[model samples]
Target: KVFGRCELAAAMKRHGLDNYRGYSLGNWVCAAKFESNFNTQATNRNTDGSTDYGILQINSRWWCNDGRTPGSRNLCNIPCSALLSSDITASVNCAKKIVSDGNGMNAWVAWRNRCKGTDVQAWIRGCRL
Candidate 1:
């Protein structure tokens, strides 16, 4: 099932992401809100022909496999379909590693393009800390 904003926020906090990798929880949630509205099954095709998968909108070019899509770096070592799950463990773990690897949230196009330099706190509004 697709998650509500507050549900998503609470889950993110429980995942130890409040101040992870020099990015705020607000940034992460903002990105996810715009990227997929907290839906784990969301996917989108980019102009480059790569697909974005799951909540963080991870790219098929370097993170996951779309089976038919070629040249997937699969650095997350996960199937793209794995990202499309209610259990976000694989997605969160891979995303954390991506940030810790120095990509920060910029690895997520949604974060870079949409959530950057904005008042992102609203993404977590009404969600208990």
Candidate 2:
């Protein structure tokens, strides 16, 4: 509900997400598309009893706290629902922080499985970014 392919690319670019941290905007878009279909309200319960939140599908295990869940490090220091905001600035910042810290886009399993080393122009093609 937050974005289509082209809109997300434009927003991401405006936020300085293009070529961020040595990773391509296409990779970020591909990962987000797979993770949550760019839905701001998307949520998924993991087998580990944690949940993924928002467009990036950031995990409760490391990035946010739902309070009822244990073992969440809340490394981003933001509530899980914060990531669900349509504005996406906080979520984008948090995602970049994670990538900036280590492993680049490898932090997202979806990126590794789907976007990594693949031609990703379709994610950003024709976007006015």
Candidate 3:
């Protein structure tokens, strides 16, 4: 499912991303916007043989195990396929794990490039969440 900006913001808030790891909800909303454009099934294969999956594009090399990435740590302990589901619960959970692991929101390159050090409030400006 492709979520609208406000829809994604609300969902992320419900999953406790409002201020998770000191990053505001807008930060997450902005990250998702650039990472996958709110597309639940988004996937990007990396040159290192790992893949980024789902809305937040959680990486296969360090997060989920696709059974294809060599030496996957599966730190999130979930199958990469789980991240593709439209439900997004697994994806959000994995994302939290990614942040809590000390990588913070910068684990997503899109966040670092686009959301970081920017006026992220614009990402959720009109969102009534």
Candidate 4:
């Protein structure tokens, strides 16, 4: 499912992403926009033989088990397919774990390239959340 901008923002906030780890809801919303255009079924394969899955594009190298990526740590203890569901609860939880694991939001290249050091609040302006 594809989410409206404000819809995604509200969902993220509801899931505790507001100011999570010092990154605001805007950062998460913006990252989601660039990473997968707020589509839950998005997937991308990296040249390094790892695949990124779902809305946040969680990686197979460390976060998910695709049964294909070599040496996949499966740190999230979930199949990559789990991240593809329209319900983003699993994705949100995995993302929190990614932050808690010390990578911060920098774990997402989309965030670093598009959201980092920018006026991210604009991403969620007027959402009233």
Best by lDDT: 4
Model 2, 32-95: lDDT tens per residue? Answer: 9999998978999999999999999988989888785786699899999999999878778889
Reference-based TM-score of each model:
0.90, 0.94, 0.96, 0.97
| lDDT of candidate 4 over 4-107, digit per residue (tens) | 99999999999999998999999999999999999999999999999999899999999999999988799899999999998999999999999888879999
TM-score of 3: 0.96
**Would you list the rank order by lDDT, best first?**
4, 3, 2, 1
How many clashing residue pairs, candidate 1?
Answer: 0
Clashing pairs in 3: none
Clash count of each predicted structure: 0, 0, 0, 0
Residue 55: error of model 1 in Å? 0.9
lDDT of each: 0.83, 0.87, 0.91, 0.93
Candidate 4 Cα deviation (angstroms), residue 89: 0.5
**lDDT tens digits, residues 9-118, model 1?**
78888898878877778887888888898899998998888898898888888888777667668888889899999987778887887888676878777788888999
The C-alpha stretches of model 2 lying farther than 4 A from their native spots are none
Candidate 1 vs. truth: CA RMSD? 1.5
Error of 4 at 119 (Å): 0.7
Clashes of 3: 0
**lDDT of prediction 1:** 0.83
